[PDB]
């Protein structure tokens, strides 16, 4: 079998290109190819110099590839060195921080976010000195910079999309060139995305799916003539680069040539390359879950795909003997367990025991399981899949039994009570078809009879149901104690602690057994009666909260809380909800904490033993009558055994199956997913490493034609993460000294928005640094090496004002500084705005619509809602989902005021805006950022001011993984607007005025955005 | 480890895991017998390292089968004939060594 080849450039008769993300080079004179550059990450992009001898390599790091940088390749010595130290950060649809292209003078021109507020600000700079100085070119944010005679052609958003083809909102590929010999004019913005663009003597050649397909085109210097030179069918051609005679490029993993003379192409023939080692090595608890309690204090677990039944200690480990993909193991007996089998059609029920070896594996299909238990009597087992149903699946038989189906969410929350004999669970339900919000109520099947009861009423959310031991009684949480908390900063209150247990007893008569009521004087033995249940109902009582789980006991109840607490690090880091273990002492009433620091937690079968998940990510097993004795899950002793060519076909038919099986519209699903299959099946085994496989499957997602499919996570590579060492300054080399060139910050009393330098007490602007950790750093040492080697430590510095101005501090030397920029960029806006509207005019930024955008608002309105006029700047605003909640403060208006006997009015609303309101908007907000600037224009708020947006409108709600932890994201939540339908997707949002932002407005310093939004708001302040 | 040219294929042959050391970096290559086939020379499975027996590599490394020769650094086949290099790596580390362990050719 071949290799996948791609990402190549030309220089004559030599083709590098990328071949097992390491860097090779071909010569087509000879016709031998051999590997150049390894070892050092995932190459995604080599660019030739002019003299065709050294090379631009970008290279990314860190598990995910989430860091990137750049190299110098030398191939007259062999020598290697890196050239950034901005650790820019990078994904799948966004590799930032690259080549940008290269200067009459031949040196080279990069591309990078580095030091910029947001990501898609990928501005141009100049590399000088092997990266000891870099110099701004202010041509605003661009992809690809080309030079012809003596003009600047600039390439804006002129990457790949493969993700997204026939893509045609409003962050598609352009192009501008110079004119007025300073002056620059938009030459190629087609309908659809451009990218990858070249010069071939006075013709710009770039590739386009205007016709539905993948094609090299080309046009003159004046964005005229267009002209179509291939017609490709197979795949798309992708990553065009040139030495000024013939044009490079790769497709279906090839890499061809194209003659802009001959207007002929032809494929090179390069063959075998390399073919690593197939049977690979892998860390366990890297790719675990599902861990489990089983019999005989043994531990059950799955990872990569691969399950197992171990020893606490995992000394004795059993792997258990199934094909891949066991989604989940379940206790199912002494020496038995259950399991789900994954595979291409579905998922399927499977027992296995470890003591005798057998392990039947029914055929009944069950669809997408995502919860599954067994009973304890070890008979049945009950399941939950993505048709919204729950079922009991014959351990014996194999035969599935759907209970109850419902058709808001998944019955993922449910327990069986220890007789075997009732089944309670959480049922998703909607009062009405277009409701707001999806209720849930506790149902509890009766397998005699087999009729389901409803343990509680229709009105809120009631969860976690459990039943005790001697199943008389069914205990539950439910979100009804409601109690508002207020918000410390704006006029607002929301339910906090709103949790609360209950209880309900089986036989009628019979009273809360919390409630403590004497036997004597109670008359019980009655029978069991499930009718009407919901209204013995009785409550627990333990003081509100959030409890996600209660576990009843003989005299004592186990509640799992978690405190209230932020959302930031959950939203974006993804950070884990620390939770605790609470005892309720039925008796004493008295509440107290068992167990700290947890952030998952399961329970076994007998009820005796504890299994958990701290916040240092280790799991734990505990008894739960004596939780002092905990020990430390081990699972990194025996090594995880894989072969990678039958990983990545099960992980490609996955993503294939999820990309069908979420999509937004079904009926396109079942056309799309069978028609591009077997195509990109056949490349998979040219993948022998994760990037490549990635390059396939993307390519595979992109032909749903549709916003939001994305994939991130996975392990891409075994190299640490490039480091940055940042104070939150610009650093100039003048002379033989680095002089800091500007300082940042924002709300200097704010927490993380100033250089820790201004902590001293002094700007250290205009001042030249000397030495740091007493090397000293200038026309020598590069300062960006020096302080990436220090990143996370405080150094020393030595600084030079003016005159004899000698500071000597101890730094922290920070290891991202972007916020800090943000914040610096937002107050500087705002303080423009404040002097141009001589005061009135306020200024708002959102950054984006999640917890950051929240914070971001409500910052600001809070200080610049009372101005006669006010401008929200939505540009680059990432989207997330509470555009609703921000358009609803921006809805109020201030209808009337408050007089105090002492002090000024009071407006009512509190959070009204009280005059005039602008919107700005670029291409770069999306998803909900769209959702936002349609909502301004539709609602009337105001005048939108801007450029198109980028035009992606459907939501995605990932909820399963790949064996090696990727995250594949499929377009599931396709957005309607009234009197639109689903038109912003794959255009976005046309502003009132549009307003674009040429090349040259960067090189004046000048806002053209921001002024316009300005003055069109002074104006309609004259009334 | 084997290298495949012709694919550029990589795979691992031996697990044993052999002990080694600057001067003693035992458990390599010996030779190659007349059927082409590659005759390895190590210490895993015997109780001194100085005893680095010869085996014949068999489907990759799946099976060993010993030579039974005693203790070899190099073996060479001529006109059927088996030549025996005993201790005949390099000595860096001791130019003009004449001690017992000397390097010797049996035939
Ligand atoms: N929950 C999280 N932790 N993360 C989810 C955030 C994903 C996000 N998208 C958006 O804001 C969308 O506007 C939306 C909009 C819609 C549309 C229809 C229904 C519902 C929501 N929201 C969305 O995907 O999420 C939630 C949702 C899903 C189902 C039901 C209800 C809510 C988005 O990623 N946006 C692009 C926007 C690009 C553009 O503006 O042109 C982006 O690439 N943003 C970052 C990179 C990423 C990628 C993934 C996660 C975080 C950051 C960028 O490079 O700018």
Redesign the pocket.
Same mark, same amino acid.
């Given at each position: 079998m071949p290799n996948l080849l791609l990402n190549p450039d030309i220089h004559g008769d030599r083709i590098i290109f990328v071949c097992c993300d390491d860097l090779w080079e071909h010569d087509l004179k000879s016709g031998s190819t051999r590997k150049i550059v390894s070892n050092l990450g995932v190459i995604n992009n080599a660019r030739f110099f002019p003299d065709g001898r050294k090379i631009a390599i970008r290279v990314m790091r860190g598990s995910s590839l989430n860091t990137a940088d750049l190299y110098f390749y030398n191939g007259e010595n062999g020598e290697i060195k890196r050239i950034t130290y901005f650790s820019g950060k990078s994904?799948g649809?966004?590799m930032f921080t690259d080549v940008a292209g290269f200067d009459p003078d031949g040196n080279l021109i990069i591309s990078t976010d580095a030091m910029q507020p947001f990501?898609?600000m990928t501005c141009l700079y100049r590399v000088e000195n092997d990266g000891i100085n870099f110099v701004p070119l202010n041509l605003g944010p661009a992809t690809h910079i080309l030079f012809a005679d003596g003009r600047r052609v600039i390439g804006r958003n002129t990457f790949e999309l493969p993700h997204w083809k026939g893509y045609r909102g409003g962050?598609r590929g352009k192009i501008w060139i110079e004119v007025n010999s300073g002056a620059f004019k938009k030459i190629v913005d087609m309908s659809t995305h451009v990218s990858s663009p070249v010069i071939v003597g006075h013709r710009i050649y770039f590739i386009t799916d205007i016709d539905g397909f993948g094609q090299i085109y080309s046009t003159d210097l004046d964005g005229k003539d267009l002209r179509k030179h291939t017609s490709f069918t197979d795949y798309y051609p992708r990553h065009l680069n040139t030495d000024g005679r013939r044009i490079l490029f790769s497709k279906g993993g090839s890499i061809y040539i194209f003659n802009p003379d001959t207007e002929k192409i032809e494929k090179i023939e390069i063959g075998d390359l390399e073919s690593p080692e197939d049977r690979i090595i892998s860390i366990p608890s890297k790719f675990a879950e599902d861990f489990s309690p089983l019999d005989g204090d043994l531990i059950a677990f799955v990872s990569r795909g691969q399950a197992f039944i171990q020893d606490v200690s995992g000394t004795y480990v059993l792997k258990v003997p199934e094909p891949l993909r066991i989604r989940y193991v379940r206790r199912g007996g002494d020496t038995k367990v259950a399991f789900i089998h994954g595979t291409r059609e579905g998922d399927f029920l499977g027992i296995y025991d470890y003591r005798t070896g057998k392990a039947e594996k029914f055929e009944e299909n069950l669809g997408n399981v995502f919860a599954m238990g067994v009973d304890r009597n070890g008979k049945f087992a009950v399941v939950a899949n993505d048709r919204f149903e729950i079922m009991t699946v014959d351990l014996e038989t194999g035969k599935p039994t759907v209970i109850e189906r419902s058709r808001e969410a998944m019955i993922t929350d449910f327990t069986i009570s220890d007789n075997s004999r009732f089944i309670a669970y959480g049922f998703p339900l909607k009062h009405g078809e277009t409701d707001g919000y999806v209720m849930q109520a506790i149902h509890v099947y009766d397998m005699e009879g087999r009729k389901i009861f409803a343990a509680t009423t229709e009105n809120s959310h009631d969860y976690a149901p459990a039943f005790d031991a001697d199943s008389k009684n069914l205990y539950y949480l439910s979100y009804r104690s409601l109690d508002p908390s207020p918000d410390r900063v704006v006029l607002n209150f929301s339910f906090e602690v709103v949790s609360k247990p209950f209880v309900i007893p089986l036989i009628p008569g019979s009273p809360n057994p919390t409630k403590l009521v004497p036997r004597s004087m109670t008359s019980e033995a009655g029978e069991y009666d499930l009718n009407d249940m919901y209204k013995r109902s009785s409550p627990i009582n333990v003081d509100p909260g959030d409890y996600r789980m209660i576990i009843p006991l003989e005299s004592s109840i186990l509640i799992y809380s978690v405190p209230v607490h932020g959302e930031f690090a959950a &939203? &974006?880091q $993804?950070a884990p909800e620390k939770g605790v273990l609470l005892k309720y002492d039925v008796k004493t009433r008295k509440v107290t904490e068992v167990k700290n620091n947890l952030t998952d937690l399961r329970l076994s079968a007998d009820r005796k033993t504890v299994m958990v998940r701290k916040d240092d990510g280790k799991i734990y097993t505990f008894p739960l009558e004596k939780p002092e004795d905990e020990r430390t899950v081990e699972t990194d002793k025996r090594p995880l055994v894989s072969s990678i060519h039958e990983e990545f076909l099960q992980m490609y038919d996955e993503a294939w199956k999820l990309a069908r099986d979420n999509y937004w519209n079904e009926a396109v699903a079942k056309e799309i997913s069978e028609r591009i299959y077997e195509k990109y099946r056949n490349l998979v085994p040219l993948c022998k490493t994760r990037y490549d496989l990635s390059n396939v499957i993307v390519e595979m997602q992109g032909e749903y034609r549709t916003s939001?499919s &994305?994939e991130?996570g996975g392990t891409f590579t075994d190299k640490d993460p490039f480091r940055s060492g940042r104070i939150a300054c610009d650093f100039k080399l003048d002379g033989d000294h680095y002089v800091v060139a500007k300082a940042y910050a924002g709300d200097y009393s704010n927490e993380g928005e100033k250089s820790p330098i201004f902590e001293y007490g002094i700007d250290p602007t205009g001042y030249l640094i000397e030495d740091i950790d007493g090397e000293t750093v200038g026309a020598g040492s590069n300062i960006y090496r020096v302080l990436s080697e220090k990143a996370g430590t405080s150094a020393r510095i030595r600084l030079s004002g003016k005159g004899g101005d000698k500071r000597d501090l101890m730094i922290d030397i920070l290891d991202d500084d972007r916020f800090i920029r943000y914040r610096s960029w937002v107050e500087a806006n705002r303080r423009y705005v404040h002097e141009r509207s001589k005061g009135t005019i306020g200024y708002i930024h959102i950054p984006?619509? $999640?917890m950051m955008g929240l914070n971001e608002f409500y910052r600001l309105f809070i200080n610049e809602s009372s101005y006669q006029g006010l401008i929200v700047d939505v540009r !680059?605003? =990432? =989207? %997330? !989902?509470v555009s609703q909640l921000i358009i609803e403060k921006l809805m109020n208006k201030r209808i009337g005021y408050d007089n105090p006997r002492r002090g000024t009015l009071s407006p009512y609303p509190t959070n009204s805006v009280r005059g005039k309101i602008i919107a700005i908007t670029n291409? &770069? /907000? $999306?998803?909900? *950022?769209? #959702?936002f600037s349609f909502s301004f224009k539709k609602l009337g708020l105001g005048k939108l001011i801007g450029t198109r947006?980028?035009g *992606?409108?459907? %939501? #995605?709600?990932p909820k399963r993984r790949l064996i090696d932890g990727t995250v594949l994201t499929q377009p599931? !939540? /396709? !957005?309607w607007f009234r009197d639109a339908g689903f038109g912003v997707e794959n255009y976005g949002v046309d502003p009132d005025v549009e307003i674009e932002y040429a090349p040259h407005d960067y090189l004046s310093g000048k806002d053209p955005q921001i002024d316009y939004a300005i003055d069109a708001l002074i104006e309609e302040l004259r009334n």
């Open positions: 994904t649809r966004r990501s898609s962050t &939203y &974006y $993804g939001h &994305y991130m984006d619509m $999640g !680059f605003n =990432g =989207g %997330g !989902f291409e &770069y /907000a $999306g998803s909900d *950022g769209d #959702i947006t980028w *992606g409108v459907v %939501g #995605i709600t599931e !939540f /396709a !957005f």
